[PDB]
Homo-oligomer: A and B are copies of this chain.
């Protein structure tokens, strides 16, 4: 009898839930979880004007069918109940409210066996094509009498509630709309001991909101060229004589996902790869790390602002740092006065003395980033000197190149001034930036020589993504891709237990970055001109 119904009839639930107003009165730093995305409808209608990509997804999922995989299902179904047209299709089940609130022109849902659960609707003022039922159970009855591929519960709040308690759902195809709307109906909370996420899609932007697609699974608690593949792997490694010390059940949730297309995984996979295959090395700091050489990450800034969601991140500091760079400053006190302590440790008397910069004032970081961006080649004296019109103003030059010669292959910003390296508190981690322009769109590649995956990298990603936006806007372009090239990529051994916790967390749709549209010159941005919207994230983690 361990031959289940939702398994026999392949009943899935497909929905789309947005965020609901946190009720004017929630306590502290709003806490987030899967239940955050729960709004279904408001006043018999959808809570949002329209979201075409979900429509395209929904329609595509509920109508797709694989004929050469049906006999198997049909075989299973009769063998169980112990038992025409031929365009094999799907059963799309709805509630009255649901069916009613669907616009005229769309019913019956094209290429789908339309079914409707109402206690007052009658099959006569209807067709036959469109079936009608009495209660949950008169549905299973109608499927044993039909030829359908899969059955999808399109729903309504009630329809979802009844099908979940009645354990008649195999999978839930859940769309996460990352924006808020007022709603009077919600999707029942999903007990994580009952259902678990096995796949997360890529992140997209549709109708001025980001969204992604996840999949819930009911928890279980010519092949000559298929062989040729095995042959070509004759020399592979892992008899799992294992490697570093990292156990299986450590990344249980992480390894149990089938499809991990969320962009955040580009960052998580690198961490996993360093933990699993990294080389043990001693380091300038004496803590010990796991490192590898050469990784690439690509984020589509036209679809989302890649602020990591698997832990909390703050941006004031890094934005002030960026504005500090653009001004061409080298005075660490400017930042310290605004309580941005990113460079504090690099400006202490002791750190400077260790760099053999005995004649450098505390917090005078030398000819670093800012100085190189606006005065490459100028003679550095001290952080208070007047460097106006001295050296090569690279920033200004790249903006001009982007504006008057966008197909140039010399649009680069380089902070690595070989001649000045020793005079710097420390050489730049972010070596250079290259820009690319095509069809009104700007892409950027940043090469980083040293990457602290646990603490630094998340911030680096946000920093250059913001910077790409800034440059795009003051050049009348739309930002496209940000490409992060990592040279020496490492994970500090003291960050391992924290990163393990982070890898087993499932990303949320990304937030979006909004810049004051009025700013038209690279030098006119101020901290109030940046806004992060819809940042849904997991709780904070101290890496150490």
Q: A residues near B, CB below 8 A?
A: 53, 56-57, 60-61, 64, 66, 69, 170-171, 173, 198-199, 201-202, 204, 213, 215, 223-225, 227-232, 234-235, 258-259, 261, 279, 281-284, 291, 293-294, 296, 298, 372, 376-377, 391-392, 394, 407-410, 412, 414, 416-419, 421, 427, 431-432, 434, 436, 438-439, 443, 445, 447, 449-450, 481, 483, 485, 487-488, 490
Contacts and interface: CB of A to CB of B under 8 A. Distances in A.
A66 B227 CA distance: 8
Contacts of A284: 407-409
A45 to B, nearest CB: 24
A171 to B, nearest CB: 7
A173 B419 contact: no
Contact of A414 (B409, B416, B436): B416
Given A170-B224, A199-B228, A232-B261, 8 more contacts: A61-B231, A229-B259, A296-B485, A392-B419, A410-B427, A410-B449, A412-B416, A436-B488
22 contacts: A57-B235, A61-B231, A61-B234, A66-B227, A170-B224, A173-B231, A199-B232, A213-B231, A225-B258, A228-B258, A232-B261, A283-B407, A291-B438, A294-B445, A294-B481, A372-B418, A377-B419, A409-B490, A414-B431, A431-B432, A445-B487, A485-B485
Nearest to A61: B231
B199 A234 contact: no
Nearest to A64: B230
Contacts of A57: 231, 234-235
Nearest to A376: B418
B410 A432 contact: no
A213 B235 contact: no
A447 B431 CA distance: 11
B199 A488 contact: no
A258 B431 CA distance: 39
Question: So how many copies of this chain end up in the complex?
Answer: 2
Contacts of A215: 228
A512 B69 CA distance: 50
Contacts of A416: 412, 414, 416, 432
Contacts of A231: 57, 60-61, 64, 173, 213
A293 B407 contact: no
Contacts of A421: 410
Contact of A294 (B170, B298, B487): B298
A419 B376 contact: yes
A502 to B, nearest CB: 23
Nearest to A427: B410
A417 B56 CA distance: 50
A485 B445 CA distance: 10
A228 B66 CA distance: 12
Instruction: List the 6 closest A-B pairs by CB distance, nearest first.
Output: A377-B419, A409-B450, A60-B234, A293-B436, A376-B418, A409-B488
A255 B278 CA distance: 35
Given A225-B258, A376-B419, A449-B412, A234 B407 contact: no
Given A409-B449, A416-B414, A232 B204 contact: no
A442 to B, nearest CB: 10
A201 B447 CA distance: 31
A293 B481 contact: yes
